[model samples]
Target: SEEVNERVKQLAEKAKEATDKEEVIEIVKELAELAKQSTDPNVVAEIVYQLAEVAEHSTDPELIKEILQEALRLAEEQGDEELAEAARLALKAARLLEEARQLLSKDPENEAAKECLKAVRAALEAALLALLLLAKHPGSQAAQDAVQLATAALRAVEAACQLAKQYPNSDIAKKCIKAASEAAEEASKAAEEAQRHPDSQKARDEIKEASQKAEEVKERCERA
Candidate 1:
């Protein structure tokens, strides 16, 4: 609607002028209120995206996580798992980046935080890579996941090897490298299985739980 565009326009400006994280939170909450009035999935998706993008500019972890979860719900509801997972990775990147800085705030040369930052970069890279793949692949969920996870394996392993080389003697680095190696192995298996079995049988009950949680937050945020 024209109203949403107007609100978004004004809100984006407000977001840009916001000099404090707390102000951004207020701006985000107001934008979310606008999202509340729109029931159309497409409109909601775009609004939630802008919300998440604006939230990224703030250092508030809870705000970032909430926006990500909000986006995940509708992205999944709208049938684009790619968007959902990108937001998920975006959340992970934010969390790790926050944790990394928190760790280094006291100790300037923390190896784990250094490696944590590296891993954060890797997650961000993977996030965009998957989004780009989905943009072109335009396949079914399983089809996209097969290709997506397959490509993910290579990048995951690549990051792992680089971390191993960069911090040769760091246990956390070693653990991450080894974990990535195993993670890549599992990712490859998932890709293969997805290809072999086009339809995956997941626990719907857990998904229902997520739906409940997402809707609950959506309502609560609107109330904010």
Candidate 2:
């Protein structure tokens, strides 16, 4: 019990001091979890408001929904429809996105794997550009969506790599590896830029390594 109280105090201080909404949102998630485990109504409202503020970008929309839903449940118990209505919209949007992802995965080879890799690479490019914009205008919906899309692309590419490895001699594997290596570079770049927006030496190093790997993969593909 003492440990929980101390953790709550530390998290609240961090939430109040966080410079970016992203940082604040992370703390809010922790605080909201803590609120759930406690019986303090005021603490619930505090965490709820902070959650809503961070959820404006709807980052991790599913988790946002869960946090908001909990907030609404607490609000309802305290007889507040206004707060519930706001959270209800977030829940709707989050659920819709989840359904869309399910539909998209139903057919992974809709246009053959090569074309799929091309499309995925283009999508990654778009996402990388958007992440760059976040440095200039941090916290837009586009920026948030870009982060999610880029992350999902990396996962897709990794999945493709696993499948491609099974067919080392196939062009499909070659093309996917090419796209995957590029996309990984892009993801690492975005993450590094977000960590140090202006002079991302870290990103530059990652880009170099990724380029070298891509070249090696390309050579292998050619030989095959």
Candidate 3:
């Protein structure tokens, strides 16, 4: 944001007035705090450069080395010839995330344009929920956003399954309960006993496959 950049600019001006003593060092520490809060790598790098420039006037060898080492290391890191490859890699990853976002943003019923309708609805939600829960726990804030969407999607479909169950006689609702049966098994045990539409053959298979796989997911998150 411009707000963050403005603060950095103000501090940079203040740095010019201060000497190698306490005031400049205080300014240096303030810039360090501002840089972290800024969350912009460019700002962070420049702050470190400025901090190193301001570092040594008040200090001994160890203090000089500490700041200069960081500044030089950062400079060397940015100057690396192989860093071109890293930029390429970073660009590639950025595109993939954008691609995934656009994919998710596309039409939902169009995915049904490509379903057993209600049955596939639950399966689709559950499948993504599985990926959210299991496969993608190496998640970032972006990944966390994806996880949040999956949670809400699964909850929406779970509500649909219950609604279909209640309005069973309505022609709008036939038996679209595919793995919604076993979804009920994992998610909720409501209304399973009486009107149990025996999707057990396929639903049973999903439960067996998913139940163990979920523990695989569970076991993996223990690394955190």
Candidate 4:
């Protein structure tokens, strides 16, 4: 935590000194990257505001829009209206740019969108595995793991679904959304099977099949 605090302070200082648009953008990129490694939402929100300060000069509005979206959520979570308003304003202009338009456009699919889908599918698979283990074993350790996995998994899926809706015309986006729904259903069935026949391999097979389908969706998203 001290390391994170130190890094944040250094970046914030650099951000204040940055005057040129490119230098500001570089600093913002660094700040965004650093924010990814920290578990503290307050620290993350601070980085978000740091990035927002340079959002007006951003040439890559698509990236900045995404960054501000995350920042906005963090700001809201931290109950900081000032930061939230700044993030929202930055996001508004960023989303109005051509790059942002294209990101949400009907063009096959975008890289960011694909990565978002893959993350959700991976989270879902992990959650299903934990659920199966808990259902079959009924142990305290397995239950704790299942809770954590499910919590993270739900967040990922919600984010994925939002991205898919954001680009409703994208073929790969549609496929990913459909696959996510089916995977959830399959995972539910797998958990039920595991609970019914804890010693049988049927649950394992079902889980594998569900995971494989998710992989297929991810592959399609990548190529799209």
Q: CA shift at 133, candidate 1, in angstroms?
A: 10
lDDT of 2 by residue, 1-224 (tens): 56666776777677667776577667766876786677665555555555544443344545545645655565566454544443443444344344434434655553334433443433334333433433233444434433444444444454554444345446656565566556545554554454344344554344344434444544544443
With a 3 Å backbone cut-off (N, CA, C), the pairs that clash in candidate 4 are none
Clashes of each: 0, 0, 0, 0
What is the per-residue lDDT of model 3 for residues 41-137, given as tens digits with 9 covering 90 to 100?
5665555435434442323333333434443344344553322222222222223223323433453433221122333233333322322222112
**How far does residue 117 in candidate 2 sit from its true spot (Å)?**
19
Predictions: Cα RMSD each? 12.9, 13.0, 20.6, 15.1
Give per-model TM-scores.
0.52, 0.33, 0.27, 0.33
User: Native-vs-model 2 lDDT?
Assistant: 0.49
lDDT of 4 by residue, 80-177 (tens): 56445445543443443333344446444665444444444344334433433432243433333333433433433444456564766566566655
> Largest TM-score belongs to which candidate?
1
Per-residue error for 123 in candidate 2, Å, reads 21
Which is the winner by TM-score between candidate 1 and candidate 4? Answer: 1
lDDT of 1 by residue, 94-208 (tens): 5554654565465556554455445544444333333333333335464455334534544454455455445555665566554554444444344334433445544212222
- State how far residue 215 of model 3 sits from its true place (Å): 58
Flag regions of model 2 displaced more than 4 Å: 1-30, 33-44, 107-224
Badly placed stretches (over 4 Å) of model 4 are 1-162, 222-224
TM-score, candidate 3, is: 0.27
| Candidates' C-alpha lDDT | 0.51, 0.49, 0.37, 0.51
lDDT of model number 3: 0.37
